[PDB]
Design a protein around this motif. Structure first.
Motif, PDB file in Angstrom:
ATOM      1  N   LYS A 149      54.099  28.018  73.521  1.00 24.27           N
ATOM      2  CA  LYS A 149      55.203  27.248  72.909  1.00 24.27           C
ATOM      3  C   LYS A 149      55.831  28.011  71.729  1.00 24.27           C
ATOM      4  CE  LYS A 149      54.133  22.680  72.665  1.00 24.27           C
ATOM      5  NZ  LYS A 149      53.097  21.610  72.637  1.00 24.27           N
ATOM      6  N   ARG A 150      54.983  28.695  70.998  1.00 23.34           N
ATOM      7  CA  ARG A 150      55.388  29.502  69.890  1.00 23.34           C
ATOM      8  C   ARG A 150      56.069  30.822  70.346  1.00 23.34           C
ATOM      9  NH1 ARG A 150      50.990  27.866  67.340  1.00 23.34           N
ATOM     10  NH2 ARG A 150      49.711  29.582  68.101  1.00 23.34           N
ATOM     11  N   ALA A 151      55.767  31.317  71.537  1.00 18.73           N
ATOM     12  CA  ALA A 151      56.404  32.522  72.044  1.00 18.73           C
ATOM     13  C   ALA A 151      57.804  32.256  72.624  1.00 18.73           C
ATOM     14  CB  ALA A 151      55.519  33.205  73.105  1.00 18.73           C
ATOM     15  N   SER A 152      58.022  31.077  73.227  1.00 20.83           N
ATOM     16  CA  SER A 152      59.306  30.750  73.842  1.00 20.83           C
ATOM     17  C   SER A 152      59.660  29.297  73.798  1.00 20.83           C
ATOM     18  CB  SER A 152      59.330  31.103  75.323  1.00 20.83           C
ATOM     19  OG  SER A 152      60.596  30.721  75.886  1.00 20.83           O
ATOM     20  N   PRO A 153      60.836  28.992  73.283  1.00 18.97           N
ATOM     21  CA  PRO A 153      61.319  27.634  73.337  1.00 18.97           C
ATOM     22  C   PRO A 153      61.484  27.079  74.745  1.00 18.97           C
ATOM     23  CG  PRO A 153      62.440  28.733  71.608  1.00 18.97           C
ATOM     24  CD  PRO A 153      61.584  29.773  72.293  1.00 18.97           C
ATOM     25  N   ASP A 154      61.757  27.922  75.728  1.00 18.31           N
ATOM     26  CA  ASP A 154      61.894  27.428  77.087  1.00 18.31           C
ATOM     27  C   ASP A 154      60.616  26.769  77.553  1.00 18.31           C
ATOM     28  OD1 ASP A 154      64.599  27.856  77.914  1.00 18.31           O
ATOM     29  OD2 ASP A 154      64.163  30.028  78.055  1.00 18.31           O
ATOM     30  N   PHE A 155      59.481  27.337  77.172  1.00 16.25           N
ATOM     31  CA  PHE A 155      58.221  26.746  77.555  1.00 16.25           C
ATOM     32  C   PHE A 155      57.932  25.414  76.826  1.00 16.25           C
ATOM     33  CE2 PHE A 155      53.642  26.178  77.419  1.00 16.25           C
ATOM     34  CZ  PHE A 155      53.306  26.309  78.738  1.00 16.25           C
ATOM     35  N   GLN A 156      57.372  24.449  77.564  1.00 18.94           N
ATOM     36  CA  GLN A 156      57.011  23.115  77.036  1.00 18.94           C
ATOM     37  C   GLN A 156      55.778  22.540  77.751  1.00 18.94           C
ATOM     38  OE1 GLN A 156      57.874  19.718  78.916  1.00 18.94           O
ATOM     39  NE2 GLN A 156      57.357  21.304  80.390  1.00 18.94           N
ATOM     40  N   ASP A 157      55.177  21.491  77.176  1.00 21.77           N
ATOM     41  CA  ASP A 157      53.967  20.864  77.732  1.00 21.77           C
ATOM     42  C   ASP A 157      54.122  19.343  77.852  1.00 21.77           C
ATOM     43  OD1 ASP A 157      51.346  21.481  78.772  1.00 21.77           O
ATOM     44  OD2 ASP A 157      50.387  20.735  76.924  1.00 21.77           O
ATOM     45  N   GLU A 158      55.327  18.811  77.692  1.00 22.87           N
ATOM     46  CA  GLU A 158      55.501  17.349  77.761  1.00 22.87           C
ATOM     47  C   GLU A 158      55.608  16.885  79.206  1.00 22.87           C
ATOM     48  OE1 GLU A 158      59.120  15.888  75.877  1.00 22.87           O
ATOM     49  OE2 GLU A 158      58.634  13.820  76.451  1.00 22.87           O
ATOM     50  N   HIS A 159      56.490  17.530  79.960  1.00 18.67           N
ATOM     51  CA  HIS A 159      56.687  17.280  81.375  1.00 18.67           C
ATOM     52  C   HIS A 159      55.916  18.264  82.227  1.00 18.67           C
ATOM     53  CE1 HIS A 159      60.383  15.888  79.294  1.00 18.67           C
ATOM     54  NE2 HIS A 159      60.017  14.798  79.939  1.00 18.67           N
ATOM     55  N   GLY A 160      55.543  17.783  83.393  1.00 19.52           N
ATOM     56  CA  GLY A 160      54.752  18.544  84.334  1.00 19.52           C
ATOM     57  C   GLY A 160      54.276  17.590  85.399  1.00 19.52           C
ATOM     58  N   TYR A 161      53.342  18.029  86.220  1.00 18.23           N
ATOM     59  CA  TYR A 161      52.837  17.184  87.284  1.00 18.23           C
ATOM     60  C   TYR A 161      51.582  16.435  86.893  1.00 18.23           C
ATOM     61  CZ  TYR A 161      56.422  18.599  90.549  1.00 18.23           C
ATOM     62  OH  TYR A 161      57.631  18.808  91.183  1.00 18.23           O
ATOM     63  N   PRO A 162      51.320  15.304  87.574  1.00 17.33           N
ATOM     64  CA  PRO A 162      50.129  14.514  87.261  1.00 17.33           C
ATOM     65  C   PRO A 162      48.863  15.252  87.689  1.00 17.33           C
ATOM     66  CG  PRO A 162      51.429  13.471  89.008  1.00 17.33           C
ATOM     67  CD  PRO A 162      52.052  14.784  88.745  1.00 17.33           C
ATOM     68  N   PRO A 163      47.706  14.876  87.126  1.00 16.24           N
ATOM     69  CA  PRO A 163      46.468  15.669  87.310  1.00 16.24           C
ATOM     70  C   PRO A 163      46.002  15.830  88.771  1.00 16.24           C
ATOM     71  CG  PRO A 163      45.906  13.428  86.633  1.00 16.24           C
ATOM     72  CD  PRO A 163      47.420  13.483  86.718  1.00 16.24           C
ATOM     73  N   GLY A 164      45.990  14.736  89.533  1.00  9.17           N
ATOM     74  CA  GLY A 164      45.554  14.778  90.925  1.00  9.17           C
ATOM     75  C   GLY A 164      46.637  15.203  91.903  1.00  9.17           C
TER      76      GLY A 164
END
Ligand SMILES: [Cl-]
Ligand SMILES: [Cl-]
Ligand SMILES: [Cl-]
Ligand SMILES: [Cl-]
Ligand SMILES: [Cl-]
Ligand SMILES: [Cl-]
Ligand SMILES: [Cl-]
Ligand SMILES: [Cl-]
Ligand SMILES: [Cl-]
Ligand SMILES: [Cl-]
Ligand SMILES: [Cl-]
Ligand SMILES: [Cl-]
Ligand SMILES: [Cl-]
Ligand SMILES: [Cl-]
Ligand SMILES: [Cl-]
Ligand SMILES: [Cl-]
Lengths: 387, 387, 387, 387
Positions: free
Chosen positions: B307-322
């Motif tokens: 996240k600190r290397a690139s603003p494009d990268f994020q961790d809020e959205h993504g796929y569900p665990p299973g």
């Protein structure tokens, strides 16, 4: 050489061009070339050199600078190598020694014409071409704040997007011989306008949500072209002029300081070069009264962000605290820090090399300075997010 | 057109070239062009398209894909814009709509010949030219691990300096239509070998003190040239082959997995594209038993570094665990994670755009992928220092 | 401009740079800018101008030169358009008028900083970079024949292969404002050393079997940087100095003429620009006694070869025979012709345009001059074969 | 190689890419590599080869082609050197011998992956990128005349300006292995559209007053990608199809010949390569009845114009008159000549080198072909003026 006329050896040293500076004591035999650093046009300071040598293809040239120990920073000659170029485009380091009295370059040019210089230069043409392209970008404007003693423009590059944001000021090359400072700005600006390998990078774009940039790539245009190290055309050390700038003696600082006062300022950087230390380092205002605890916190935080942005940057080596306790607020970063209470730093790059990450072929150079400039935007994004 | 012969409108759609794929139902009137996504050569999966349209200069073309809702990821057509190029060098997004049944491109070509594609392609010629240049760098070697089903090389790029170091593996484009993955590798490698604007940057050099890189820019050469989305020439989904790779069906994974086993591995990255989500995101193995607490700590730490290397990268959205708890260890990152207990992640970039930082002209593209690749080296340097 | 400080209009004209020249009478309102051609540094001749205007983005600028009819060639202002550039790299023509007294440029700059000039300049940096690259080619040497009044080198470029051959001399820019002459040499040399689109061309190579080239790209370095039209730093018209060159007044011609005398000469070309005529043309020595019949034959034959090498070249328009019957042998081509009895010509290119083949966007410019230079090698190959 | 896994020698020859062609008999030891020319896909003709060799960095490779004397032109192997490239961008000649039975390449690759080929290739990607850029020029259009047997476009490039003019037709690469023909067209077109070093040249512009150009850069797209020498995908020799072209067997000539018939033609050129002769030469229709005296006059005049345009071109060596008296009008230039009574020539460039002007490093190559193409425009301007 095939024509009787060209046959024989005819060495010529010349220096009438942008940033040229040398005094020739003697230039008959290639193994006995005697020189002197010419020194600044109206000041006793002397260190910068830049000259063309022709007629020495394939001859071993031993070039001795007689007054090396009389220069501004004689320690700058220890573990130092001169730079050379056959075309003014590609620069490389050459064998150089210093015995405590004299500097000697011992080099065999491979072609008919070669230039030698204290560091990779950065010309008025390059500057005018660069800003003339940068201004065409949608996020950039160029503003002429005033004129130098000799009528060259003082140009401000303003980079940002439409609306308030933090005002970030970055000034470079108050000491005209520190051409690394303008290389550094070139790299930083290229990234801000998205050129080349910065084309798909989103850091600039994020930054523009938080900040607008006010950048002066060359604080001392007259001193640059004159081939000075430390002073403008009038003999003024621009970085001692921040308390009483003068229309006749130091207009360069007069007009820029008026702009910072008229616009405001929330982060300030003064880009420089250091002759002696082979390290990249920063100096702040911690060794001064009026330095708040939240200032220590921000400055400390930013130094950590910069170490994380570039391995070249470090905080172990640097100068002792009372290096300029005497000159106080005559220095730009000290003055701005005090007037605005913001993060205000001097950034310093080496004329020698980064001793931590050396490179035999180039030492410290334009490309490395430009990369450090681009890398620092990362540290500013961190900082601006954190505060 | 000035010659009676050229006069009139004669539309032609063709697709016999690297990565070409389309079925033409009808192509007489420009406002009535009917198409179908052709689909993978030996698998029911269908999404990738790439074709040339000539003869339509100045004509409004309405191009309808009839089977859009029968494709692998119909959600991929929502808020999606096709990409076009007059020369295969410069790609831009064009007006596109989806009604839940059919995709329609509505565009007026400005020239006689234009190409349309699902995403900016990356050809076998580009690959062979790139690796053919990269191999000449002193820190790079190229090794041919084996052959694909159709006799194309499986090429490994090894980057490092002489001696142990952490072994970092990065593989790309197991799904041949995810050309962003190879763009990403191009950017990462350019920075590792110091080309262009990475020339004076010291990150690569620092990295080589801690790590050696083992990189496969194209895991599925046959699928790429065939214009498949998800499978190789034999119909295999390479990212379901990590438990039982086969010499005839999935040699691509056979030979690469043998190399990772024979060399070792300390950080692993599998570069991919996601059709549906307009975000850049990572998926790890936290939702799996055998995932240690020190693994949670490292993975978490690395996500923060990225996240600190690139603003494009994020961790809020993504796929569900299973999302793939069923397929378990058939997936590369899950398998490597388990075999080696190291940081192992899938990195996923959008076919649409980064909804956080959109760009009307290009959406997500090669340049942005290449920048993300270069930026991730920063995150690896942090990680490797911290552990 | 978004910051109260930048708001308003602040026009500034500056000219302290290589080839800069202007006198500013008044520069407050953009529609009332008053200027004068500054004129040569030690001579009454005046025509060349070159200056930077900032602060006029989007403002209609009406710039009037008050002394236009007092200049060296007032006919040069008829059907003439000034050239402009936002970056010193790309130059274009702007709307310009002349009423018999004053020249007026009427133009709306699209950016914050623009330069205006009498013709596309050619700087000392470009020269030094070019010769610094050319010297590295196996068929090229650069020799410094001497120094100009102000200590700039007089540089000779020698191009040929190992062994006798015809000695071809080509000198350019005796009149420093005729920058087209150095553009012309750049194109000719690029082709001789095989750069760019001349890479696989065999003309140069054939030429080297018959000839060696002795080329001076800039006969008047001091006059160039000074922004003069017609004279050197001492006030001398170099092309009136061929009978009695002087070490103090005209060293440029002293050292070059000594070289031609010491080496020999079989074809001679003096490259120039003409302010008035919108045509490319040549002038020889036919209108002089001592002009043999075999000289008429060769000169005639060469004029035909040049028409066949380039459509830009023509022989219909030109100057009348007794244009300089008075100055006789003070002119380079007349002198060389007489001393050596070889083909000796002045080649002249327009400051306006080629009226036969006009171009609204650029008029005559650097690229067209460079193409004419490259094309002339074809004519020399024909000539040398025929005699 | 530092990793036990890469250690040892593992040679691999691959050829599944545009224009690839080789049969590998044996490839275990580097000094014992055994190969065969694969030959055309549906014809007994065999000569073209193109393949990648990996794993041989620093190993001396002795590569023997067993069937060399069974190829289409065994004389083509005498004084012939194979071409190689580490990156598909830069090609150089390598040591090669022929004993009357077998061809042997004896070379030590400097890197991990190298390609060997019969001549510098010219790919479908290059073609599509080139025409995709050329079409954007104001004087150019691209028209798709039809499809090849395998559905690749037959593309016509039309270059001219608005209005009658002479119609000049230039077709290239009927024999797909003669990649020099498409290099030649690239150079000719670049000059016609004013790119690069042709930017300020007025020849194209003059030509457009007299002529319009109808150019087919690649007559045999299928044969090219297939790595054939002489035939299309169906086994047809396109240059024997001009009397009875067929929709299924030779559509390439069907559609082009229909266009020449529907448009008209006043000068015709068929660009080719010759395997045996190390010379650049032209062949016309003089050795045929129906060849008028004014045709002899024009053809003779044009041959002289071409000698004057390029030293590479010559008329001393070439083939004897009855080389194809048997095949008569099945050949393009013979047919066009007869149907239209205009100047109609075959132009032939060497696979070896120009024995008159050899180059050890490259032999004949793309750059030299491109220069010859650009040079021929000069000859056409002369011709068109003279008639
Ligand atoms: Cl000096
Ligand atoms: Cl200071
Ligand atoms: Cl304030
Ligand atoms: Cl540190
Ligand atoms: Cl298809
Ligand atoms: Cl998957
Ligand atoms: Cl292990
Ligand atoms: Cl996030
Ligand atoms: Cl001036
Ligand atoms: Cl004159
Ligand atoms: Cl003589
Ligand atoms: Cl004429
Ligand atoms: Cl094959
Ligand atoms: Cl034939
Ligand atoms: Cl007809
Ligand atoms: Cl001949």
């Amino acid at each position: 050489h095939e024509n009787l006329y060209f046959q024989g050896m005819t060495l010529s040293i010349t220096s009438n061009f942008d940033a040229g500076a040398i005094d020739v004591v003697s230039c008959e035999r290639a193994d006995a070339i005697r020189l002197r650093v010419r020194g600044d046009n109206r000041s006793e300071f002397a260190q910068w050199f830049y000259f063309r040598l022709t007629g020495a293809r394939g001859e071993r040239c031993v070039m001795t600078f007689e007054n090396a120990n009389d220069c501004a920073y004689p320690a700058g000659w220890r573990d130092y190598r001169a730079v050379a170029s056959y075309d003014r485009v590609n620069w490389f380091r050459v064998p150089t020694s210093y015995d405590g009295q004299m500097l000697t370059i011992d080099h065999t040019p491979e072609f008919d014409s070669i230039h030698y210089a204290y560091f990779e230069p950065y010309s008025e043409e390059r500057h005018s071409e660069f800003l003339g392209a940068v201004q065409q970008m949608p996020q950039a404007s160029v503003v002429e704040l005033g004129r130098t003693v000799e009528g060259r423009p003082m140009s401000l590059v303003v980079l940002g997007t439409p609306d308030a944001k933090k005002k970030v000021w970055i000034i470079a090359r108050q000491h005209p011989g520190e051409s690394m400072a303008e290389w550094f700005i070139e790299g930083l600006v290229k990234r801000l306008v998205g050129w080349g390998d910065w084309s798909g990078d989103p850091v600039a774009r994020k930054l523009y949500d938080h900040a607008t940039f006010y950048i002066v790539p060359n604080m001392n245009p007259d001193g640059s072209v004159h081939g000075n190290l430390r002073t403008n055309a009038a003999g003024a050390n621009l970085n001692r002029e921040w308390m009483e700038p003068d229309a006749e003696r130091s207009p360069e600082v007069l007009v820029v300081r008026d702009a910072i006062h008229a616009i405001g300022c929330d982060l300030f950087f003064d880009i420089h070069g250091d002759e002696d230390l082979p390290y990249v380092f920063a100096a702040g205002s911690e060794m001064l009264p009026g330095f708040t605890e939240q200032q220590r916190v921000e400055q400390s935080a930013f130094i950590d962000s910069f170490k994380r942005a570039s391995p070249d940057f470090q905080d172990e080596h640097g100068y002792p605290p009372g290096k300029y306790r005497e000159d106080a607020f005559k220095l730009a970063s000290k003055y701005i820090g005090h007037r605005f209470g913001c993060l205000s730093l001097t950034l310093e790059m080496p004329f020698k090399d980064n001793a931590n990450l050396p490179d035999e072929h180039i030492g410290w150079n334009g490309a490395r300075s430009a990369s450090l400039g681009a890398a620092m935007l990362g540290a500013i994004l961190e900082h601006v997010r954190a505060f």
